[model samples]
Structures are given as C-alpha cells and as structure tokens.
Target: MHHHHHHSNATGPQFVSGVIVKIISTEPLPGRKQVRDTLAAISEVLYVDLLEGDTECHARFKTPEDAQAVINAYTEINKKHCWKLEILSGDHEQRYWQKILVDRQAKLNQPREKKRGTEKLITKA
Candidate 1:
C-alpha cells in the first residue's frame, strides 16, 4: 500500500503538501526522468520522488500554484508528443480542510468507470 505524509513549508504562509503525478506514454523512463529533472530545477520544488518504477512521481512544491505551474509548464513543453500528465494533490493540500469540510466536498468522489473499448482510446486523427 502507498502512504503519504505532509510537512510544513517555512518559506510560505501555507503548508506545502504532497502531490502525485502520473505520466503516461509508450516510453515512460525518458519522460519521467525529464519531469523529475524539470521539477527539481524549479526553485519552488521542495521534494520529489518516483513511485513504482517510472510510471508515477510524487513531488512537493511550495504551494498549489507552484505545483500547478510546474505541471502546466511540463505539459506545455511536451504537448506535441503523445504523452500525457495527470497531476493530483494530497489530502492536506486543501486550503481549509477542517473548516470547509461540512460545505465543500470534492467532486467525482465515486469510483471511476472503466473504458468500454480500447479502440475509443486510440482514435486515428
């Protein structure tokens, strides 16, 4: 089982949280390496770790905005290729988790539906 922990960021007013980003492609290693390097190069990155071989990675940035920027920049740089990125924030990433718990619940909480056919995923364009 995979578990995550949260650590406070001294530089920012808010606590930085963990994030998991899965990069999918026919070739994963080279792309994963590039993403890791790119995130590390960014000054906002607090920490980064690869998850289960090279399919996914966990990175901690100074804030959600910084994390979003990193992902956006990486995706923009590689949009021409067939690769794709899915970035998700950890539990503590929420701005006001305890205070807003009663009112604001995360959407798409139900289990995700599987694809009906593989052909639909590989459309010829």
Candidate 2:
C-alpha cells in the first residue's frame, strides 16, 4: 500500500476518513489492482486495500473530498464499463467489522440466485 506522508497545509482544515467501496461487476469490470492503482494515483489517498474476491476495497484518504475524488474517478470508468460501485463509510472500526463479518455471513445464509452464463471478471486481481 502507498502511504501519502504529506500533512495538510497550514491554511486548511484537514478532514480524514476511512471508506469502504463495494464493487459489483460483471465480466469486464476493471481489475482490483487497476482500481487500487487508480485510486492510489490520487495524491491525497493514504492507503488502498483490495479485499478478497474482487468485490470490495477499503481506502483511507486525507479528507472526505479526497474520497469523493476517488469515487468520481471510478464512476467515470464504471459508467463506460457497465460496472457497479458503492461507497460506504469505514470511519468506525466496528462498522467495518460488521460489514465484513456479520453482513457477509447473513448474505451467505441467503438463497442463491439462478446462474447466467459465466463471464470473466474485469478486475481479477
């Protein structure tokens, strides 16, 4: 993970936040490493973690605006690629825990839907 070591300028108030971005894509979604690299390319981003299974990533940024910038970047490509992206706050550790563990378990317990033809994932990283 790349860490932006620069601190906020003296003239501005700094607002940092953790965000969880859920990516649900059919074949052709940009790969996980691509997403990670794209977001990391933004100077304000502190770290990016691509979760297992190519479905989610948790990122830390120097400010909410920074987070929004990352989201906007993804939105552009997502629109072109026909993928889905959801951004949720990871400001609290407990929220991350529940989302990662409890919510996932609940989803696993649910019924599976009928399968469509298998397609390749865009971001397999």
Candidate 3:
C-alpha cells in the first residue's frame, strides 16, 4: 500500500499498467469504498481510484500477477453481485477481462456471513 506513492514518479520501467474495473448492475448502487478496500488489501496493488458515478474505477498494479490476484480476491467475496474487470492494455484479446455473474435474487436468499478482517475496516469514501 505504501508503494502507491511512488507510482507517479514513472522514472523506471515496471510491469504495472492502469486497469479499468467496472461494477455493473441494472440498478444504482452504493459501495465504491467496499470495492476500493477489497483491492487495497492485496499485495503489489499500487493504488485504487474510484471514478465518479460509482460504476467504474481505476487501479495500478506493480505486476500483472498482482492485478490478477486482486481480481480473483474481489470476485470471491462479491460473487453475489454483478461486476467485470478489464486489463484495458496488454493482450487485448487474450487477457480480455473477468466477471462474476450472480443472481441478486439468489444471493438474497442465501444467509449473510459475518464480515472478516479488512472487510470490517472498509469505510465509505
């Protein structure tokens, strides 16, 4: 997390790339901070910036692997919601994107689980 400060320097070559991850749904939502905190806990995640409208956000990773890690982590916890992640740069066709297709109604029927660790720490921004 502390490494995010050096991201703006751009003095050396790094495997990092800016990625756009979208939180899509048929209705309005309000959990940008939750998404932000989810990614922020992962290692090598340089920074996460939520854009206006709460539907889209940007993130910078120290390595493509780190980007993938964040995506996987977020998907596991937010499987009840609909969302997608796109690399936007390298491998436009090969490394296309990732998404979690979950039925909101089905999710509503499932029992809620207790928040764990960082999840309880996440706050709105």
* Top TM-score model: 2
**lDDT top scorer:** 2
Winner on lDDT between 1 and 3 is 1
Better of 1 and 3 by TM-score: 3
The lDDT for every candidate, in the order shown, is 0.52, 0.56, 0.51
Instruction: Work out the TM-score per prediction.
Output: 0.43, 0.46, 0.44
For every candidate in turn, the CA RMSD to the true structure comes to 15.5, 14.8, 15.9
By summed lDDT, the worst window of 10 consecutive residues in model 2 runs over 9-18
Model 1 stretches with alpha carbons more than 4 Å out = 1-16, 19-22, 31-33, 79-82, 89-125
Clashing pairs in 2: 31-123
Tens-digit lDDT track of model 1 for 1-125:
45344565423334333444445555544544575676666435655655556655555554567766766776654554555555653443353233234333543233567555553443323
Which rank order by TM-score, best down to worst? Answer: 2, 3, 1
CA lDDT, candidate 3, residue 84: 61
Report the error of model 2 at residue 54, Å. 3.1
Q: Per model, state how many residue pairs clash.
A: 0, 1, 0
Candidate 3's C-alpha runs over 4 A off are 1-31, 42-44, 91-125
